[model samples]
Target: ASRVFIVGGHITPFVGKGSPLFIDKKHPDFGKKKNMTLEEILATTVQGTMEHSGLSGREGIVDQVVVGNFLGELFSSQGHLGPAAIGSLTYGQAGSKNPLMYKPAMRVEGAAASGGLAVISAMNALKSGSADITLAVGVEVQTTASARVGGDYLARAADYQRQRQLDDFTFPCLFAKRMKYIAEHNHFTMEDTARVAAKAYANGNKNPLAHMHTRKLTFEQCNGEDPSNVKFLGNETYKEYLRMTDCSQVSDGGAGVVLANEEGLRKMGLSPNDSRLVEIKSIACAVSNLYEDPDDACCMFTSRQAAQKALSMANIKPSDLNVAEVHDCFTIAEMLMYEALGIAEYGHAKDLIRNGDTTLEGRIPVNTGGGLLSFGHPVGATGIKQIMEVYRQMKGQCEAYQMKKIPALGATLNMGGDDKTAVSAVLQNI
Candidate 1:
């Protein structure tokens, strides 16, 4: 059986240099710590995940390692992440021996989707019999440079040659441009975007690991009335369409998940009823032309295609997803995602927000960990973090934000580069 189960996973607190969590030592959360280098982030998350799995490298527990990183070369002056990952692990009971000296290890990349792709790559290894137990790691350290420099580096995700010249903040401008037209065609109001941001901030407040966990947000702040909620000035025409609250933060963090097959599960001394076990029913990845524009930004053809195929593989409809962790790279993106995931029809996602169906106590909760806008987007780490969130929700491991009833099934949709790359996974409680 190629079925894969998530044995354990861990994620570093998502924070940016701009976040109070990193800058204010006098703050209540000062002791939680933040601001790790690229290597530190990876090592901390990998070691934490391994610790949770009740194994050390001494036993040769992990058959293979896959690392996801998008801008290591630019930010860390580092690449060839395979060795970096193995080097982070302890050798054996001896603690310093190199027991995993030559195991198969590789790095994967797909812009922001790198993390999700890393998870998929590990699952593929399990399915193809290349390995039984696999560890997937995704890390990014974006605070090394100025925000302006980081924005330029991020533009590499798009057709940089042509699209970079479009605006100073290429991605935000592009999303804002699309947001204006999408809102117009779909008839979703500014209130809807405000609700999405407010909802995300509310959930983020409950998630200790969220970047904005200590920051409180209100409907007034997100509704374009607060002076602190600055509008985008990159393009005046679309200025009002996007604001500070609508954007995802640039963060530095890492996340890791250990996935295993039946043999691997047995090796871990786990069974079908293990309360901690979360099974991966199906996962799907899709890509669109990087050089071309989406036929309709609101439609999110690529995201929809991946979600539809993943649901089909799991033999379930959208209604079966009791919980979800979707890519909210921006407030508008989350709105588009509701439609893309088939939970709402095109132009009707507003109803879900208006009816409070996507809230923590609503019909179908989403982004219980705040989502990118408040949880932080550490580029490469986001995909694996999304999966880890779903895994935690299923296992009832989420402390403060835990659902009243554990969801039997959950899914994640991590998109990269304006819907250019999409990775969707459907998971169930084992």
Candidate 2:
């Protein structure tokens, strides 16, 4: 099989997500990308990658391009890569044999699963037949689009236009319903959920690129001294199960990777011994029909199907993973995912939290890089960033959050559309 080799990858710091996207939680920068236009940021991210990859000096080798973007229309009206095949208009010097000449590019948008889906697509391109080298990139310029001076898209999260007529709605209402279900079914307490958020902060504090690097939380501080402290109001209070701190930090960021088939890797002047090259052993993406139970979040089915398939394709089990990164859009979501991914027994996810089995030194470290909780959730970028984190950890590049034991296997689970989509992947040997 023509393995899809991730020969080059990088992720901008999850900085300033709120505006310009928020410079400086101490006033920082937008992951160091140009926070002006979506196009400029992605181009710089993709173009700058090869320079460090030792794959530079070659132009127009990109046989295909697939960008993962969700909410890009709102983020920037002018943004939106290729949906079908966004090719290389940048290097489209027709009839030139140069790798920098005209290739094709397309876009992938499946809510938040866009990034991982893009990878799945790239892998297919390589494995299908020829040495189809593909580039997978994801970007979300929240602040970039916000400052567009009245661009039409407005950079919002959901279908507010249609739903607004129903009520003054926000996503919290849906998450709150999910919390209610978890508590009622499994007694997954707010303290248990808050502990998950607190753990993210502890890990995020060590990550220099975290958007809220200075913002740390403690389980004691979050869940408080009594039962009332662990409640689910979804508001400003830490006691609110899915509280202010337990939610995703929407920010501005970009991430990408160049997928090289075996031949493509050699042509790009890279080696199998290259520590930066990771093997994509298996990957899959699936979706759930909107549930009758609004609180389901579809984790039980959607996430499980995706996780099991990807892991099966890799011939590994849940316990086989050394580390993982799931779409922790909220604390409750991660709690549910443990069971769905089989990291924890169904209805026993809280046991992992209560017993400290889910920490960096625990049984399994879920979000080793503080995940979206610390890095800030730049929807499109989050999934790829998750993959990038696993890659860095595989190569011992994650100085602070690197696992003491290099994981023989690592995985990422990305979700979209309130549990409607799930994309799971397994990686090894960077």
Candidate 3:
């Protein structure tokens, strides 16, 4: 079997409409300083990843390309993203024949796990001997509309036929509904969720690429009783349980990863022991029925299965992970992930949060660059972004948010739509 490896990766700064990078007039879109259009984001991300991977567009090194995206048609009025990815790249000469042309390119969508699916597909192509060097990219532009409008579009990820009528922000409402039950049943308080948010922002303050990097949140402000914490969702029953601080942000961004096999390493003039390499120990995925309810709402059945399968394939235990980047789309989700990923015993995940075990200096520092709440969730790009964070931390490329001691083993869990689609991976530093 051809073992898969991540050569290098790049991610545009996750930004929201309030972010200066989203609409800066000075140096606007210059040298990829900012992002404005879907075309610009794709081009900037592809070019940046190629540069990082030591593969130029003219090298003919990329054998296949896969893009992960959702709601391009509804949000950006764009589709045909397979070829659109190719069109975004720049060949050496404008008039000369393009080396990257005619390569197999396609788009994959599994809601927020779109990027993870893209990475998995690229890895599969390389392992199956169909391609040597494959490029996987994920891009999402969600700041183009108001929150209500964007919320409606995101609601499509759920059982739209059955759940869309539940609320305008169907996804948040669904999770909120889960939060009501899980909190009451598990005996965890909203304060624990505040700890998750506080930790996320503290980490975000150190990450220049994070959306909330400029914002600071103290533990007190994130507390449930804080006046600043407001229940903002429109759902009637679940509204009181969720606050603005507990929810992930609405943002825009893209991320890309380059995967290769042994032959690909040689073709790219790279060695297996290269300092920049992050080997993929294992990657697995799982899916559940898209119903509004699950057999057990407290436990993410799909996420748990995916993570266990990945860890089992890698022959490692949950305690073996030095770091992790799970889908913290909501504070409640992070708490739930602790149990799903086996980091904490069932109903005891909140103990880790309250005890400060998940912090940067804790046993398994998670989301060191901030997670969806503070780093920003660009939907399709978030999964790739999580993978890229693991890669970046392993390579000591996280800049200000870099861990004092680089991690050797890491894991990432990317979930979509109430954990309907889940992808998990265990990575090892080479």
lDDT of 1: 0.88
RMSD of 3: 2.5
Candidate 1 stretches with Cα past 4 Å from truth are 24-34, 57-59, 90-95
- Per-residue lDDT of model 2, residues 1-430, tens digit only: 6677777677876766432335533445435634445665576557655554555656456677778888766657655466322323243344644454346666778777888888887788788754367778887776653323212232133454543222222454456656766666665887787798898889888887787677757787656553443444423422233556667776777788888887787777777767878888989887876433344542467888899899999999999888888888888788878887888877788888888787889867888878777777777888788888888888888888778988778888988756668899998886
| lDDT by candidate, in order shown | 0.88, 0.71, 0.88
Per-residue error (Å), model 3, residue 367: 0.5
* Candidate 3 structure quality by residue, lDDT tens digits, 288-341: 988746757789999999999999999999999999999999998999898888
- lDDT by residue (138-158, candidate 1, tens digit) is 999988787788888999898
What is the total number of backbone clashes in candidate 2?
25
Ranking by lDDT: 3, 1, 2
TM for every model, in the order presented, reads: 0.95, 0.85, 0.95
Worst 10 residues of 2 by lDDT: 146-155
